[PDB]
Design a protein around this ligand. Sequence first.
Ligand SMILES: [Cl-]
Ligand SMILES: [Cl-]
Ligand SMILES: [Cl-]
Ligand SMILES: [Cl-]
Ligand SMILES: [Cl-]
Ligand SMILES: [Cl-]
Ligand SMILES: [Cl-]
Ligand SMILES: [Cl-]
Ligand SMILES: [Cl-]
Lengths: 464, 451, 465, 452
Amino acid sequence: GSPDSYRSPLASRYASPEMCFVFSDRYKFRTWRQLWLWLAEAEQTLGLPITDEQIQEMKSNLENIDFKMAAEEEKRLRHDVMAHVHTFGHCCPKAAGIIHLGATSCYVGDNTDLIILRNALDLLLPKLARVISRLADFAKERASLPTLGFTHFQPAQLTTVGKRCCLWIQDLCMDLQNLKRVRDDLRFRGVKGTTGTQASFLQLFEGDDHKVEQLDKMVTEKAGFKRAFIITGQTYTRKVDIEVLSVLASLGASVHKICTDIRLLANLKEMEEPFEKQQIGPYKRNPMRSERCCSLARHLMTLVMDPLQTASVQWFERTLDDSANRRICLAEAFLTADTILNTLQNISEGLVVYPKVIERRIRQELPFMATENIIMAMVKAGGSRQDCHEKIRVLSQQAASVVKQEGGDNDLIERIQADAYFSPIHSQLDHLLDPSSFTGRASQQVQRFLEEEVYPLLKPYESV
Amino acid sequence: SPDSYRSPLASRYASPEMCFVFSDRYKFRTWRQLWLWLAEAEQTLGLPITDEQIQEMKSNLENIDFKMAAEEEKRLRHDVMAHVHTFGHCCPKAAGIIHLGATSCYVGDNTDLIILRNALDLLLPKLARVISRLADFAKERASLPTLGFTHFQPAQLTTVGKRCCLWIQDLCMDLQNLKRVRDDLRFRGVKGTTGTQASFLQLFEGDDHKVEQLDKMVTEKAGFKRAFIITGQTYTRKVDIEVLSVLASLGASVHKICTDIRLLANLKEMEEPRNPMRSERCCSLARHLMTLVMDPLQTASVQWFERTLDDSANRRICLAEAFLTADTILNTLQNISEGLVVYPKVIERRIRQELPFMATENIIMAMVKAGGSRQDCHEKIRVLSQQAASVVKQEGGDNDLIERIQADAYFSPIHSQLDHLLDPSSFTGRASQQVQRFLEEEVYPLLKPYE
Amino acid sequence: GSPDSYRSPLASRYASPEMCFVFSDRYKFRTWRQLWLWLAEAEQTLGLPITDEQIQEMKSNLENIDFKMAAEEEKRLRHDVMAHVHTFGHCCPKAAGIIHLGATSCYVGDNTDLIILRNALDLLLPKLARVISRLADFAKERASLPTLGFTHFQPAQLTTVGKRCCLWIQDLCMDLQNLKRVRDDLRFRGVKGTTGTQASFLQLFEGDDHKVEQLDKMVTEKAGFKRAFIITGQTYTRKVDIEVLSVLASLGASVHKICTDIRLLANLKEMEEPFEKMPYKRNPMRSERCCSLARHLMTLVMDPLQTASVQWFERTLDDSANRRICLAEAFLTADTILNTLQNISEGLVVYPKVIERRIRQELPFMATENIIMAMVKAGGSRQDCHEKIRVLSQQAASVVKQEGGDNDLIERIQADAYFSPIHSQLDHLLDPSSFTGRASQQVQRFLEEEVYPLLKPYESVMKVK
Amino acid sequence: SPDSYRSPLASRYASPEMCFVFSDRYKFRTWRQLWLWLAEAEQTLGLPITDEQIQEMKSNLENIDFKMAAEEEKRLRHDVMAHVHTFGHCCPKAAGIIHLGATSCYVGDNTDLIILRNALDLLLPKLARVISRLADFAKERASLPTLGFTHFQPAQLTTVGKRCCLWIQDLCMDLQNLKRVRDDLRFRGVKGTTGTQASFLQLFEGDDHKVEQLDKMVTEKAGFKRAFIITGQTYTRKVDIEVLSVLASLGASVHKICTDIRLLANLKEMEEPFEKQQIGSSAMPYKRNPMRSERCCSLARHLMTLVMDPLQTASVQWFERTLDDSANRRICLAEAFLTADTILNTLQNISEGLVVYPKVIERRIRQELPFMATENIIMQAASVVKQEGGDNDLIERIQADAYFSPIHSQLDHLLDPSSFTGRASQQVQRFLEEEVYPLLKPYESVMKVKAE
Ligand SMILES: [Cl-]
Ligand SMILES: [Cl-]
Ligand SMILES: [Cl-]
Ligand SMILES: [Cl-]
Ligand SMILES: [Cl-]
Ligand SMILES: [Cl-]
Ligand SMILES: [Cl-]
Ligand SMILES: [Cl-]
Ligand SMILES: [Cl-]
């Protein structure tokens, strides 16, 4: 692309070449020809006057596409499909008269879109499986590392770095399920005619309903779909595009949340994005990859409104106000998702943790959450609950004033150590303030989660 | 009071049953229910709770002093502790063990899940019922030809019932979505302030097994098959995305269906049980259902760590509104579907005006079959078509293409064929067989469990 | 009402009584009657058979509204306007025959919607002005107080607490200007008939176009509007609802940003929400609520965008139920947000020693160029000094991250005799006020030039809490 | 290359001029322009910058080595520093003073503002031309009666021109909104990395007036009347909301207009203009699809969808800036303007020679009018129509009944369609003179430019 024209940053800058190719005109028109080859093979099988020589010349010329010629013919014809029937028949002169036999434009246009959507999903699925797997390794590594919990982004009951990572993983697992469900349930349009009635194919087969049904089943199987619609207008219902982009929107919400947490952890200096390759010969580090993931994820959420609106105002058996919008949103949704998953994998590969910063923060906040434990110990040693409460309240106030009014380190535990009133529990104080004892069931939750929910989910993706 | 704003969703639009599901009575009775279950399970697991305490709670689930709870909430600045205190007031014997070990979201967030599920349960039979009425209609009208439209321009004929199947199929997809979401909803259970169950762990003196039993048992008592293992304070707000996304997609389906119905009313081919007001209302509400999807998308995207409370007010609005809106739509769509009136004579007249321009191909094939040239016959049709089209558009007159073809001696080999060549049923392709196969394979089996 | 049914929390928990009333049935049907009165007044002036007695009796019974009779008459008739014509005629027996004369439903329905939108904008405006004024006071108070700057939420060139407050204030001033513009530019529908062509009134005035135009002008002026549409279909263009809810959505975005910043400052213990009628751990719950509701305001913009987009011809009635929801909810949501944000703004809590400690931890890493320059001025080498400061800074950075320790960079500089030509200077070189650039002067000029002048019209309502 | 994806906005849809405004060439020449302006102002303010340094920069604003700059961005990990280095290579005399005292968003963010303003400037005349073509049409059809539609059911007659005025008025509102947003855009200027101008205050050795002078000077050289006083790192992202919200609302207007045209096309009352290849063709198709209208709807829909991107972005900016705005804005701001530009090009084409069939219009009026004239006559046919799809026979029944003898001779006059259109034709004329013409007058000199 020239620097003198706009180039989508989703092609040029962001997405992988594999996803870029799925949405390319090369892939599109090659798949159009592929569909025409399948149609010819099935029509031959069903008794139509098509030869093995005609089939073989189509098969040899699936990739040999004259784009200049197609574009020229599209000018005079003003019909993209017929422009390509012409260009295909030019390089396939024996087969020319039977290309597109009995079909309408959407046999190629709309089935190709479904193949594209399915192949795009099949590119995302393994990438999403891989990021989940890398985060699972991290979660298990850090399963028992105590970290300050945050509710309202204020100190709260301690969690572990790995348990927090499980919140992230779980949302991504829900995405993996949704994506796989939408992919697997996607139906083929098949051979349906202009308004879905198969009137053209019925006539071609001389009123033979069984042959129309069989043809529909054969192209569906050749394209590798399990199932075709029975009911369509001109195209697959545009409710499908809502299903697909809704699950991508939800994925975007998940990633926006995870990468927001990561950016906040980076401010706290508890976690940072992976160190990047050394240049031959820094204190401050910006979580730029997580920022980019948020930025893009937002756009994936935004896009959901396109297919919602499109579907809601489709009139009868189709209106073509779906077409320009789909050319933008379907491709953009997938290229944005791809980019996000490529970046998130890169974030996952060697996340940096600073346990001494984490520890320090716990030591600042934990004492204000440990006071019932200190009361219980005093009471167990023969002390008075009332007096211990009154005394803890006063020392706690003193420490809180050091922290806020003076900008000091929390000295509550040191106040308690120095006060002879707490003499009966001074020897227990390290044990009573052990952060691992305040993480509840965090580490066991990680283990049960990974074994019962995450590994089983990943198992079938081990091939790809 | 007419002196204050009153939700049009509550007063005007939605059913009393769905309004009740989102009422404070339902909410606070469910808080008490969850406190009962917690005590029952805690007793089984060895905690000092008596049968008398449990029976007292059980006799007072509905006995709620909303005035006291609202006054205590002003004092304590804490809705849950306000309801603990109020419940303890009418249950003095149980008062010390209500909420034992629990945190606020044990009642708040589990109650939301209960509500979401019961609201889906109310929608499910309504949607099946609509699909069923429309299916009866599609079957009745499976063979009735009607003009096809692409670009809202005359196209290959369909049937009234085949078109109806486009509508039915989107609604079947909605039905399956709502059911999946309903069945897959998991319980929060007992999870603590940050999801670690630390408060329960301490209540059980470090016994993990007891914590896991408690979680299993309250989940069972609430009638859920599964609880989360992993939470922060609350169930992941991704769940609310999943729920409102299926409602939004439902709204898109309804808007499309009710748009087609409004267009059919302009064409005088079909009417609702004279303006298509029910269909307009459906569209108007369906649009709001689509808009609402952005609320939970945004919310989940900016939850920090184990929860921020910027979810709360938003969810009070969007969750209830989405369900109350969806309910109204289904009640209205039910009324539309019970009384669709078709005017076959209007349909027939429109077909007779448009069909000739679409029959030019079959006229050419018949001339060929009695000897003629393809290219001669195309050019003869082209001139007569051009003339008929001028009469239609330039003169505002009825289409005379068939009369033109009869009056031209060239078409003598065909003249006696013309009535049959332009029989509308012969242009509907496989429409009626598609209806029957769709109803038997796809719709009936879906509906059978609901009947 | 009853706890046995849904009650919108916008009406029952969140919005002010005044905003709730603007969207009430009482207000709506009083305004219908008002519009009937004005119609009758203008109709008499242009010579229609309407007497002072008939007029005086409508004026007497503007508020005397029997809702039960209106509701039963609507159940019988299934037309809200005719039900209200009949109910108004019942208590105005002498005027009954002239009420609604020559008008169509939207004369009352749609003109009332405009009067509501305008009144609702008028309630928001002074609330937004008060928030701006409280925050201006804060920005002035805190103009010179250094604080750590944040880009990517990482340490950056110091700002001041007041300068950062001006980021918030500016966006709110842009919202105030938008709300006012929209309020001012709102046009009346006036008298337009069923399809915008004024046929009913043309015929009522026996073909006199001048009298139809005068009626339109006169009802418009009686309703307090400067200007009526020339062109309508049945109703005002629904593009208007986009204009109004877009400005509210943008206000939501500003508030969401501001309150997200406050939430982050509260985590950092630098700023907290005002003390309520001293606990160590405090949650920024008002700010969280403002974010929550601001989000809904943003969401709602998609309602009028979609509605306008699919209006067929001179009106389709698929706008009606949606507008009953989104127009009221957006204003009630905005009202709540403004009431809450004004509360947040009254007595914000700042912890300067927390702010100072954080600066002391981060500033040395940003001071290393000021130090190099002071070495270069006393003789030394830019490149020499750069390599020595890099090694010590790396050591200090490792104390911070690998050990969880306080930053010791200035201590390591103090203890290294290579820096002896600048040891006397270090206190001055590390003065935080010298790192805030022009923050304090920016505050002063902004408040003088851009904020105080916007507030000037609202001075008489400024002091309410 | 057809072997990767390419935005259909760049290749297929938008005009080359809008495409260029969002191009890398435009971007990076604008960086260099801003660096030149900076140097010129800094020279005036006394910094050691020579006329030769300035002239060397001025001679190389367009001489951009994209390949080298990309490679340098990879080495330095910094887009601005890559461009500083690459510009210093072609301007070795100036190399030492390029970007002097500035920070990254001096070029990045000011360039975005120049782009936004340029883009708006391209849209305005296009919209003005649409409005003018429709105003021509409205005027010529001001009196042509046509069936009014409420609920898309027969309602009080309007006129083809009056109906077109509904479309025009929405677009006039868009044109005023676009103009306001363009006029109100402020320059970021020189603000530093957190908005405090610290780097410039240091460059000028603590002289505040010099910093203020530099901000004023770069703002003036860039053609902006006003700079922000207050920024963080960048201009407030509220500005992006303001700009995309006006485009969204334009999208809504265009969707409604093009939905009406599609419905009229179904009714055969109005069609999209004959394409060049069809004009006078003896091969004119009977069935014409309103494809340009469909396209405009489809695109206008995306415009409306995009409004959620800047809403969300602004809402979650933390403090003096977070860089989660960057990728999103790269997408949405360019897409919104390419989509709008496409819509306006197409809509201008639609507006130039709309096809009207008065005899179709007339026949539909005769079907519905007898039912709307009963009031005037007092001074079954419905069941036939509904059950038989027959022609309306109400008038024919009336002339053949004894009872209506007093009225019979008026029945032609009483059914005159012109008498049912109310004030539609006068409304058109007052609207055009008072509200439309005055808005178009600034655009007189570019009215004649053709559809693309
Ligand atoms: Cl894997
Ligand atoms: Cl077909
Ligand atoms: Cl096909
Ligand atoms: Cl806990
Ligand atoms: Cl709990
Ligand atoms: Cl009228
Ligand atoms: Cl009126
Ligand atoms: Cl700076
Ligand atoms: Cl700068």
